[PDB]
Design a protein around this ligand. Structure first.
Ligand SMILES: CC[C@H]1OC(=O)/C=C/[C@H](C)[C@@H](O[C@@H]2O[C@H](C)C[C@H](N(C)C)[C@H]2O)[C@@H](C)C[C@@H](C)C(=O)/C=C/C=C/[C@@H]1CO[C@@H]1O[C@H](C)[C@@H](O)[C@@H](O)[C@H]1OC
Ligand code: HEM
Length: 393
């Protein structure tokens, strides 16, 4: 009786047709994911937004429940497994240090790093793999700059970080070594910034105060490693997907070459359009019985809120399947919604904008070097995107 879930095919970015069918005829339905409990699935924009925004839907049961999910292993802990008021305290302290101003201040360095990456990619000759050489490098290097990791240490910190990618081919113990190296390095960097503060985010986290209160040593460390992992693969995947779309849809590339000022609005539109998750936002758990479009979701039950389907709801976005780089309004849920809305989003925006700006400026003819039908897609099962993107220009 519940439908097998996910509906999305991982071998591309297509939004499964089942979502549109369900938005019309069964907007709140039952699904059986590959691992974890059967769950409610919500697909309309209004209902996804309601689930992500409602006080009655919590994340804390993620710590113990067999969470409906797409892989055998779990992704749990950190802010995304917390609820108000504990979540609220940690969040206030972080955003006091990790501001929209600080994200914007990283644009000039993000551009320098992007141009160095294009230098290095171009120098390996054509075709070159945009994923390994650019998409997998820019976000982790930008997080190193954000945090305050010295330049000299970016290559090794990058190597450690790559072990946390859901596409990494590494053993339980190799992941273990990598995490221990990253955590020991970050613990020492925190200790150095406490003694001698600088202008970077670790120093600003150490100095953050809210209602007389501050981040403990353990919270500082968990937050720094958490921001790295939350901000690396996501951004890397989204860069690869946006450039894949630019290379395969000529009008999109043309419009951004002719009007580079449309880049920030294009980043919003691509974030709305690309159904980046294989499945949904992380499951929310009813704290009491909730009626949604006539269906009773009982206290304790999990709900999968598809921001992928939501952002393609024809009731919210006129001609929702068209990519219109100048779409206004554009209140998409691609960075989430409610108290857990992406805290890295101002920085993700700078990076995605910088990625398109620099690739288009330096390589206006960038295009696939193999037929599109021959691209190899990630089977990490969390996010969708190409494993390799051989490009020519
Ligand atoms: C908040 C910090 C936390 O941040 C996340 O929980 C991020 C989750 C992202 C939102 C996720 O994306 C969403 O997925 C959906 C399937 C689709 C969504 N969408 C397109 C709508 C997409 O937005 C995930 C899957 C992104 C990928 C790259 C990932 O696995 C990140 C893990 C980060 C964990 C870190 C926590 O770190 C762990 O902290 C605990 C405390 C440590 O002891 C240690 O263990 C450390 O260990 C890495
Ligand atoms: C394009 C890249 C990114 C996308 C698409 C993205 C998307 C998301 C979404 C949809 C959520 C909400 C998840 C949910 O409610 O289930 C989220 C949360 C979060 N994101 Fe991002 N993100 C990206 C980049 C980043 C970056 C660059 C950082 C840090 C530098 C970051 C840090 C976080 C953190 C810490 C959370 C949890 C916030 C909380 O629970 O209060 N993200 N992200």
């Amino acid at each position: 009786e519940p439908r097998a879930y996910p509906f999305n095919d991982v071998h591309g970015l297509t939004l499964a047709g089942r979502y549109g069918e369900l938005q019309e005829t069964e907007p709140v339905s039952r699904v059986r994911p590959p691992y974890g409990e059967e769950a409610w699935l919500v697909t309309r924009y209004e209902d996804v937004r309601a689930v992500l925004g409602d006080g009655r839907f919590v994340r804390g049961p993620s710590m113990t429940r067999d969470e409906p999910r797409t892989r055998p292993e779990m992704v749990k802990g950190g802010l995304l497994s917390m609820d108000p008021p504990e979540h609220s305290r940690l969040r206030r302290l972080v955003v006091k240090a990790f501001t929209a101003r600080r994200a914007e201040s990283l644009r000039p360095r993000a551009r320098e790093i992007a141009h160095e990456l294009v230098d290095q990619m171009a120098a390996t000759g054509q075709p070159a793999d945009l994923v390994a050489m650019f998409a997998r490098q820019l976000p982790v290097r930008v997080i190193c700059e954000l945090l305050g990791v010295p330049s000299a240490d970016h290559d090794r910190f990058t190597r450690w970080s790559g072990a946390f990618l859901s596409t990494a081919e590494v053993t339980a113990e190799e992941m273990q070594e990598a995490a221990e190296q990253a955590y020991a390095y970050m613990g020492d960097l925190i200790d150095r910034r406490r003694k001698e503060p600088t202008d970077d985010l670790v120093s600003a986290l150490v100095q953050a105060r809210d209602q007389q209160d501050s981040l403990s040593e353990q919270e500082l460390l968990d937050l720094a490693i958490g921001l790295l992992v939350a901000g690396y693969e996501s951004t890397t995947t989204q860069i690869a997907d946006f450039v894949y779309l630019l290379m395969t849809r000529p009008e999109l590339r043309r419009q951004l070459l002719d009007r580079p000022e449309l880049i920030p609005s294009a980043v919003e539109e691509l974030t709305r359009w690309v159904p980046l998750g294989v499945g949904t936002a992380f499951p929310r758990y009813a704290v009491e019985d909730v009626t949604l479009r006539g269906v009773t979701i009982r206290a304790g039950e999990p709900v999968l809120a598809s921001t992928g389907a939501a952002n393609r709801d024809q009731a919210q976005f006129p001609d929702a399947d068209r990519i219109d780089v100048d779409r206004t309004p554009n209140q998409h849920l691609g960075f989430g919604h409610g108290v857990h809305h992406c805290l890295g989003a101002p920085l993700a925006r700078v990076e995605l904008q910088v990625a398109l700006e620099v690739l288009l400026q330096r390589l206006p003819g960038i295009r696939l070097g193999i037929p599109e039908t021959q691209l190899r897609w990630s089977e990490g099962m969390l996010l969708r995107g190409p494993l390799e993107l051989p490009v020519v220009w």
